[PDB]
Scaffold this active site. Structure first.
Site, PDB file in Angstrom:
ATOM      1  N   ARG A  64       7.890 -32.441  -4.671  1.00 43.88           N
ATOM      2  CA  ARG A  64       8.982 -33.228  -5.151  1.00 43.88           C
ATOM      3  C   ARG A  64      10.322 -32.757  -4.615  1.00 43.88           C
ATOM      4  O   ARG A  64      10.531 -31.513  -4.327  1.00 43.88           O
ATOM      5  CB  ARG A  64       8.940 -33.327  -6.670  1.00 43.88           C
ATOM      6  CG  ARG A  64       9.424 -32.071  -7.358  1.00 43.88           C
ATOM      7  CD  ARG A  64       8.894 -31.914  -8.792  1.00 43.88           C
ATOM      8  NE  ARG A  64       9.607 -32.710  -9.792  1.00 43.88           N
ATOM      9  CZ  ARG A  64      10.824 -32.461 -10.270  1.00 43.88           C
ATOM     10  NH1 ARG A  64      11.533 -31.426  -9.819  1.00 43.88           N
ATOM     11  NH2 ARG A  64      11.342 -33.270 -11.211  1.00 43.88           N
ATOM     12  N   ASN A  99      22.287 -34.693   9.740  1.00 45.52           N
ATOM     13  CA  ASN A  99      20.962 -34.406  10.214  1.00 45.52           C
ATOM     14  C   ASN A  99      20.740 -35.099  11.516  1.00 45.52           C
ATOM     15  O   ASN A  99      20.642 -36.339  11.566  1.00 45.52           O
ATOM     16  CB  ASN A  99      19.938 -34.923   9.256  1.00 45.52           C
ATOM     17  CG  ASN A  99      18.617 -34.209   9.409  1.00 45.52           C
ATOM     18  OD1 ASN A  99      18.510 -32.936   9.247  1.00 45.52           O
ATOM     19  ND2 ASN A  99      17.602 -34.964   9.621  1.00 45.52           N
ATOM     20  N   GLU A 117      16.066 -31.104  14.534  1.00 41.66           N
ATOM     21  CA  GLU A 117      16.452 -29.684  14.127  1.00 41.66           C
ATOM     22  C   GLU A 117      17.922 -29.435  14.112  1.00 41.66           C
ATOM     23  O   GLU A 117      18.396 -28.739  13.247  1.00 41.66           O
ATOM     24  CB  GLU A 117      15.687 -28.653  14.971  1.00 41.66           C
ATOM     25  CG  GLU A 117      16.088 -27.240  14.665  1.00 41.66           C
ATOM     26  CD  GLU A 117      15.441 -27.003  13.308  1.00 41.66           C
ATOM     27  OE1 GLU A 117      16.010 -27.397  12.311  1.00 41.66           O
ATOM     28  OE2 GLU A 117      14.247 -26.836  13.338  1.00 41.66           O
ATOM     29  N   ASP A 119      21.492 -29.468  13.090  1.00 43.85           N
ATOM     30  CA  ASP A 119      22.319 -29.928  11.956  1.00 43.85           C
ATOM     31  C   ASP A 119      23.821 -29.490  11.947  1.00 43.85           C
ATOM     32  O   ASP A 119      24.162 -28.436  12.485  1.00 43.85           O
ATOM     33  CB  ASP A 119      21.686 -29.486  10.621  1.00 43.85           C
ATOM     34  CG  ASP A 119      20.191 -29.517  10.639  1.00 43.85           C
ATOM     35  OD1 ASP A 119      19.555 -30.628  10.558  1.00 43.85           O
ATOM     36  OD2 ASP A 119      19.571 -28.367  10.674  1.00 43.85           O
ATOM     37  N   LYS A 132      24.359 -25.674  12.543  1.00 45.93           N
ATOM     38  CA  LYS A 132      23.200 -25.077  11.920  1.00 45.93           C
ATOM     39  C   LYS A 132      22.002 -25.306  12.807  1.00 45.93           C
ATOM     40  O   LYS A 132      21.805 -26.448  13.331  1.00 45.93           O
ATOM     41  CB  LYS A 132      22.984 -25.733  10.567  1.00 45.93           C
ATOM     42  CG  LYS A 132      21.608 -25.470   9.945  1.00 45.93           C
ATOM     43  CD  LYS A 132      21.674 -25.629   8.420  1.00 45.93           C
ATOM     44  CE  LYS A 132      20.329 -25.603   7.746  1.00 45.93           C
ATOM     45  NZ  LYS A 132      19.242 -26.535   8.144  1.00 45.93           N
TER      46      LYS A 132
HETATM   47  N1  LIG Z   1      11.151 -30.327  -1.663  1.00 46.95           N
HETATM   48  C1  LIG Z   1      12.426 -30.124  -1.430  1.00 46.95           C
HETATM   49  C2  LIG Z   1      12.743 -29.606  -0.211  1.00 46.95           C
HETATM   50  C3  LIG Z   1      14.015 -29.379   0.149  1.00 46.95           C
HETATM   51  N2  LIG Z   1      14.941 -29.645  -0.736  1.00 46.95           N
HETATM   52  C4  LIG Z   1      16.356 -29.330  -0.460  1.00 46.95           C
HETATM   53  O1  LIG Z   1      16.524 -29.098   0.919  1.00 46.95           O
HETATM   54  C5  LIG Z   1      17.126 -27.825   1.177  1.00 46.95           C
HETATM   55  C6  LIG Z   1      16.710 -27.231   2.462  1.00 46.95           C
HETATM   56  O2  LIG Z   1      15.358 -26.959   2.508  1.00 46.95           O
HETATM   57  P1  LIG Z   1      14.906 -26.490   3.993  1.00 46.95           P
HETATM   58  O3  LIG Z   1      13.511 -25.982   3.994  1.00 46.95           O
HETATM   59  O4  LIG Z   1      15.161 -27.742   4.842  1.00 46.95           O
HETATM   60  O5  LIG Z   1      15.967 -25.410   4.511  1.00 46.95           O
HETATM   61  P2  LIG Z   1      16.999 -25.166   5.695  1.00 46.95           P
HETATM   62  O6  LIG Z   1      16.810 -26.353   6.792  1.00 46.95           O
HETATM   63  O7  LIG Z   1      18.309 -25.148   5.067  1.00 46.95           O
HETATM   64  O8  LIG Z   1      16.566 -23.961   6.387  1.00 46.95           O
HETATM   65  C7  LIG Z   1      16.727 -26.966  -0.021  1.00 46.95           C
HETATM   66  O9  LIG Z   1      17.559 -25.829  -0.163  1.00 46.95           O
HETATM   67  C8  LIG Z   1      16.848 -28.009  -1.117  1.00 46.95           C
HETATM   68  O10 LIG Z   1      18.261 -28.169  -1.348  1.00 46.95           O
HETATM   69  C9  LIG Z   1      14.611 -30.097  -2.027  1.00 46.95           C
HETATM   70  O11 LIG Z   1      15.528 -30.230  -2.834  1.00 46.95           O
HETATM   71  N3  LIG Z   1      13.357 -30.341  -2.383  1.00 46.95           N
HETATM   72 MG   LIG Z   2      17.675 -27.943  11.494  1.00 49.11          MG
HETATM   73 MG   LIG Z   3      17.750 -31.548  10.418  1.00 47.84          MG
HETATM   74 MG   LIG Z   4      15.822 -28.132   6.926  1.00 50.42          MG
HETATM   75 MG   LIG Z   5      16.329 -22.727   7.968  1.00 50.60          MG
END
Ligand SMILES: Nc1ccn([C@@H]2O[C@H](COP(=O)(O)OP(=O)(O)O)[C@@H](O)[C@H]2O)c(=O)n1
Ligand SMILES: [Mg+2]
Ligand SMILES: [Mg+2]
Ligand SMILES: [Mg+2]
Ligand SMILES: [Mg+2]
Length: 192
Positions: A64, A99, A117, A119, A132
């Site tokens: 979720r 994104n 990827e 960001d 990012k």
């Molecule tokens: N199932 C999920 C997955 C991600 N997310 C949100 O997406 C953010 C980023 O998850 P991510 O694995 O993409 O992390 P990064 O791309 O920031 O490394 C999390 O910190 C949550 O804020 C969520 O709310 N529920």
């Molecule tokens: Mg990325």
């Molecule tokens: Mg992205």
């Molecule tokens: Mg991510």
């Molecule tokens: Mg990351």
């Protein structure tokens, strides 16, 4: 074209199939803007393994949407969307998340894209932004997740938006950061 509040699929398609797919509510669907709403609690549907790029990274968090709901904003034809991100405790607008991804295409169930990827993270009321995952992207390009033509085009896409933002010329209306969903726009559990 989809109606206001219609529930549709937003999918990242990899290997010809859904890497991730989740139901979103349409907020706008026009030739200048596709906006959709991903609500807190929504079910995320992941395709079965193996994928050429491994399991979708959001499986760390489970199946979720755990954070506060988000608005996705997308200008048709362009290689990214802009997410309105809110604080999960306080509900306050934290930032624009750009994104970088494939230009969205309309499918009979909704829209399909693919994360690329790269960001950009943009603080509220700011022309300074944080890059990012640039080096992460360049490694993935190195090992062939993207072909050289695709990688060239991802970097161009990303550089384009980065320039517009830093110029103070964001394509999108900044009033979206205060937009509030109608009541009852809550978790959606269907899977496509
Ligand atoms: N199932 C999920 C997955 C991600 N997310 C949100 O997406 C953010 C980023 O998850 P991510 O694995 O993409 O992390 P990064 O791309 O920031 O490394 C999390 O910190 C949550 O804020 C969520 O709310 N529920
Ligand atoms: Mg990325
Ligand atoms: Mg992205
Ligand atoms: Mg991510
Ligand atoms: Mg990351």
């Amino acid at each position: 074209s989809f109606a206001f509040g219609a529930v549709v699929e937003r999918r990242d398609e990899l290997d010809g199939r859904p890497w991730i797919s989740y139901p979103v509510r349409v907020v706008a669907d026009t030739p200048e803007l596709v906006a959709v709403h991903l609500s807190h609690g929504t079910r995320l549907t992941f395709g079965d393994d193996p994928f050429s790029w491994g399991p979708h990274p959001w499986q760390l968090f489970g199946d979720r949407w755990q954070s506060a709901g988000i608005l996705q904003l997308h200008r048709p034809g362009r290689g990214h969307s802009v997410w309105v991100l809110r604080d999960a405790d306080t509900g306050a607008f934290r930032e624009w998340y750009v994104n970088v991804e494939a230009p969205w295409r309309r499918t009979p169930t909704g829209f399909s894209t693919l994360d690329h990827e790269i960001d950009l993270v943009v603080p509220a009321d700011s022309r300074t932004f944080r890059w990012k995952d640039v080096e992460k992207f360049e490694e993935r390009a190195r090992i062939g997740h993207f072909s050289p033509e695709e990688a060239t085009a991802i970097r161009a896409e990303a550089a384009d938006v980065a320039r517009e933002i830093a110029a103070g010329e964001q394509w999108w209306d900044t009033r979206w950061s205060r937009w509030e969903p109608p009541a009852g726009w809550n978790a959606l559990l269907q899977s496509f």
